[PDB]
Design a protein around this nucleic acid. Sequence first.
RNA 1: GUGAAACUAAGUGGAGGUCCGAACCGACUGAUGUUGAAGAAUCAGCGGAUGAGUUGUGGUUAGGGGUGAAAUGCCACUCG
Length: 72
Amino acid sequence: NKGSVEFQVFCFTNKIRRLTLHLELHKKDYSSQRGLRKTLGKRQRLLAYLLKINGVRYKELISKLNIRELKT
RNA sequence: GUGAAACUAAGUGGAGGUCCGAACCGACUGAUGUUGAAGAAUCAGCGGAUGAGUUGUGGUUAGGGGUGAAAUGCCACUCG
Ligand SMILES: [Mg+2]
Ligand SMILES: [Mg+2]
Ligand SMILES: [Mg+2]
Ligand SMILES: [Mg+2]
Ligand SMILES: [Mg+2]
Ligand SMILES: [Mg+2]
Ligand SMILES: [Mg+2]
Ligand SMILES: [Mg+2]
Ligand SMILES: [Mg+2]
Ligand SMILES: [Mg+2]
């Protein structure tokens, strides 16, 4: 598949969502928790890049994926 | 607010052997009375007052016993 910016966020959005349901049961899996914050951080720096390059794509991507916008 | 929670601000809600305070139930202090109006009361304040609350009617437990949030206290002005 492609490697566009919005596509990487879509895969992380599923990779993140897939692990939340896992931690509801295996909450003591702290090694996976260290991996969960990576994908949460990788998308943070990509969306941080998408923001200052084009705000139109930002408002459209966050709207369909139901993403919380950051203050400041 | 967070990945989701923890946490956190308002509003709604009206909890409590909660607060003040009448009835009601109690009886802490003092005065008066003390051949008393009264064989424990009057007067002025005092405590609890949605509770372990108060009360009526109809019943239960009877003495080498009964009952007792236990004083040897109560059991028809009578109770080691
Ligand atoms: Mg009260
Ligand atoms: Mg009161
Ligand atoms: Mg009494
Ligand atoms: Mg009085
Ligand atoms: Mg009173
Ligand atoms: Mg008072
Ligand atoms: Mg009180
Ligand atoms: Mg008899
Ligand atoms: Mg006899
Ligand atoms: Mg008597």
